[PDB]
Write an enzyme that holds these catalytic residues in place. Structure first.
Site, PDB file in Angstrom:
ATOM      1  N   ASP A  39       0.839  -1.193   0.000  1.00 40.60           N
ATOM      2  CA  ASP A  39       0.000   0.000   0.000  1.00 40.60           C
ATOM      3  C   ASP A  39       0.879   1.250   0.000  1.00 40.60           C
ATOM      4  OD1 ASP A  39      -3.302   0.079   1.090  1.00 40.60           O
ATOM      5  OD2 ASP A  39      -2.190   1.912   0.997  1.00 40.60           O
ATOM      6  N   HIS A  69      -3.370   6.058   4.063  1.00 48.15           N
ATOM      7  CA  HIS A  69      -4.173   4.889   3.651  1.00 48.15           C
ATOM      8  C   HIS A  69      -3.553   3.554   4.101  1.00 48.15           C
ATOM      9  CE1 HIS A  69      -5.791   1.998   0.549  1.00 48.15           C
ATOM     10  NE2 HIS A  69      -6.881   2.739   0.658  1.00 48.15           N
ATOM     11  N   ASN A 161     -14.368   0.330  -5.680  1.00 54.88           N
ATOM     12  CA  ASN A 161     -15.437   1.192  -5.190  1.00 54.88           C
ATOM     13  C   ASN A 161     -16.225   1.891  -6.302  1.00 54.88           C
ATOM     14  OD1 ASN A 161     -14.317   0.712  -2.471  1.00 54.88           O
ATOM     15  ND2 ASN A 161     -12.706   2.154  -3.061  1.00 54.88           N
ATOM     16  N   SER A 224     -11.363  -0.887   0.467  1.00 58.16           N
ATOM     17  CA  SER A 224     -10.009  -0.895   1.001  1.00 58.16           C
ATOM     18  C   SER A 224     -10.024  -1.207   2.481  1.00 58.16           C
ATOM     19  CB  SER A 224      -9.345   0.469   0.802  1.00 58.16           C
ATOM     20  OG  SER A 224      -8.717   0.551  -0.464  1.00 58.16           O
TER      21      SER A 224
HETATM   22  O1  LIG Z   1      -8.809   3.824  -0.704  1.00 56.92           O
HETATM   23  C1  LIG Z   1      -8.795   3.548  -2.007  1.00 56.92           C
HETATM   24  C2  LIG Z   1      -8.528   4.647  -2.991  1.00 56.92           C
HETATM   25  C3  LIG Z   1      -8.574   4.220  -4.455  1.00 56.92           C
HETATM   26  C4  LIG Z   1      -8.881   2.762  -4.748  1.00 56.92           C
HETATM   27  C5  LIG Z   1      -8.936   2.384  -6.061  1.00 56.92           C
HETATM   28  C6  LIG Z   1      -9.213   1.070  -6.407  1.00 56.92           C
HETATM   29  C7  LIG Z   1      -9.437   0.132  -5.407  1.00 56.92           C
HETATM   30  C8  LIG Z   1      -9.375   0.546  -4.084  1.00 56.92           C
HETATM   31  C9  LIG Z   1      -9.095   1.851  -3.789  1.00 56.92           C
HETATM   32  O2  LIG Z   1      -9.051   2.176  -2.379  1.00 56.92           O
END
Ligand SMILES: O=c1ccc2ccccc2o1
Ligand SMILES: [Ca+2]
Ligand SMILES: [Ca+2]
Length: 279
Positions: A39, A69, A161, A224
């Site tokens: 990540d 993140h 998402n 995520s």
């Molecule tokens: O927090 C996130 C931000 C972008 C994203 C794009 C694809 C899959 C999961 C993702 O998660």
């Protein structure tokens, strides 16, 4: 063991019904397992990791998480207060930049890296990789995820998402890995969660409180956030000896809460990650 006033997602994965606030889990807590969080990095010095996190590889100028993140996802896997597997070992691999972006070539390198690196580490109960990332379909990205899984690592990936069929996204669309959709505290599919036949399981993904950079915490939402719940649960189950890396996704689906979720489109599994804990 029981954590009272736990984040809702932790309570949910140890209950057959929504609305509870206690997370029940076996004291072993994933000790002896290892989870790689691929990540934006991990702020390894956050007190919530208790010295159990470390950065092992970066593809950028620094190994620091300048985004937040990756630290959040890692916290859901294995922080003391916010984590599913509270005694697991966390390894950070920084394939996303501080804006949360990364090229497919770097993401693939990061997966191949973990497949090799795990051979240098002491993880007697097994190894998990959590990938809270994705983008448009790529057969090369899928192939890299399939190799990581084949090498003996339990691979969990975000469904995405886009409120769309995950078949058009990678690595979500690689069937051999464990593709995770998101739900909310009312047992509804999260409004942004991808769906489709490729999903293997759902986990808590809306309004998830976890660690953040600067030694802080914050609540955010996404597939995520659901992915590390499943990655931590896998680590927890491998430590207990209930399953192995090769079969953990199937075992989680087999022992899931079934039929509890609403707004699941026909053709998508109605299965919610559940630890089956009995004191
Ligand atoms: O927090 C996130 C931000 C972008 C994203 C794009 C694809 C899959 C999961 C993702 O998660
Ligand atoms: Ca139920
Ligand atoms: Ca699968």
């Amino acid at each position: 063991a029981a954590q009272t006033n736990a984040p809702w997602g932790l309570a949910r994965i140890s209950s057959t019904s929504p609305g509870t606030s206690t997370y029940y889990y076996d004291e072993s807590a994933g000790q002896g397992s290892c989870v790689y969080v691929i990540d934006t990095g991990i702020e390894a010095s956050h007190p919530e990791f208790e010295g159990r996190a470390q950065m092992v590889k970066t593809y950028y100028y620094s190994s620091r998480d300048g985004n937040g993140h990756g630290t959040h996802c890692a916290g859901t896997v294995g922080s003391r207060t916010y984590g599913v597997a509270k005694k697991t070992q966390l390894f950070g691999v920084k394939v996303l930049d501080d804006n949360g972006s990364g090229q497919y070539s770097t993401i693939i390198a990061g997966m191949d890296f973990v497949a090799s690196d795990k051979n240098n580490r002491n993880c007697p109960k097994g190894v998990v990789a959590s990938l809270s990332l994705g983008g448009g379909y790529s057969s090369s990205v899928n192939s890299a995820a399939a190799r990581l899984q084949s090498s003996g690592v339990m691979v969990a990936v975000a469904a995405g998402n886009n409120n769309a069929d995950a078949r058009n996204y990678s690595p979500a669309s690689e069937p051999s890995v464990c593709t995770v959709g998101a739900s909310d505290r009312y047992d509804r599919r999260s409004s942004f969660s991808n769906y489709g036949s490729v999903l293997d399981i759902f986990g808590p993904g809306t309004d998830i409180l976890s660690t953040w950079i600067g030694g802080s915490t914050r609540s955010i939402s996404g597939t995520s956030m659901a992915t590390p719940h499943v990655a931590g649960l896998a680590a927890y189950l491998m430590t207990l000896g209930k399953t192995t890396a090769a079969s953990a996704c199937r075992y989680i689906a087999d022992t899931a809460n079934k039929g509890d979720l609403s707004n699941i489109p026909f053709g998508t599994v109605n299965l919610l990650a559940y630890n089956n804990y009995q004191a």
